[PDB]
């Protein structure tokens, strides 16, 4: 396209007050609608979440995991 040689009309970034008020109002309205939909919530919710765990690139994954295991063993035998 010949944009460099024959530029077209610029698009103003100067925000009008009418636009700022409208966008703020509609942002607030969307937030309230999201809150009401979350109140509705026709979806299940669980207690425990999927913990991704220690990354495979951790230098001490083996040590941490065996620490955890001996902790479980100790807790089980003590309790």
């Amino acid at each position: 396209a010949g944009t460099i040689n024959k530029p077209k009309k610029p698009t103003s970034k100067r925000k009008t007050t009418r636009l700022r008020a409208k966008i703020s109002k509609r942002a607030a309205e969307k937030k309230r609608k999201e809150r009401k939909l979350a109140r509705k919530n026709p979806e299940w919710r669980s207690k425990l979440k999927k913990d991704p765990g220690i990354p495979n690139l951790f230098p001490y994954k083996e040590r941490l995991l065996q620490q955890r295991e001996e902790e479980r063993i100790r807790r089980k035998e003590e309790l």
Binding site: T3, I4, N5, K6, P7, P10
Partner: protein
Amino acid sequence: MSSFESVVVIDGKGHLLGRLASIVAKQLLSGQKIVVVRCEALNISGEFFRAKLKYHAYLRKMTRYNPTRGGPFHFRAPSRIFYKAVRGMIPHKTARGAAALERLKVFEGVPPPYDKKKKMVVPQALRVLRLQPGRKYCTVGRLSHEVGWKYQDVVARLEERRKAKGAAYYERKKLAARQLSEAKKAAAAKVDPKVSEALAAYGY
């Protein structure tokens, strides 16, 4: 070092347009006389097609009924481009701004009045000190020539002549400096042992 001079001449080669204009405008409003040379050697950051696009948009902006009066006068010379930046940074619609703009002077190339004068540099606007090495830049002279500046070749020829004369002057400077070095050692003995060590102790 915050020094006041009568008139300071700024060599425009390798200087960023906006930053040099900022420094120059602040100096003009503080009361310092500025003479900017080599406005065609000035630089603009970004790339040349971006600069040319901006100038073509500037050309697009024009008054309808009467282009003669009230319209944006699109000056194509690099000195006028730099002057446009400085004027946009100075409150030109006041008496104070008019006085500052009267303190400002700009030229293309280095006229013979200013070729024998000292040209200062602004490290706060230098391209090689400011831009990252991998970044692109364009030349105000090239932009002016591609928008319609008619006198690129004349200024180039005059700069060639000035550089030849400067080379002759620099050969003379070599002769003078060599003679000065020989003169210093020659009277290094004929002087006074005390004075010599006295200067060494006092830092000269």
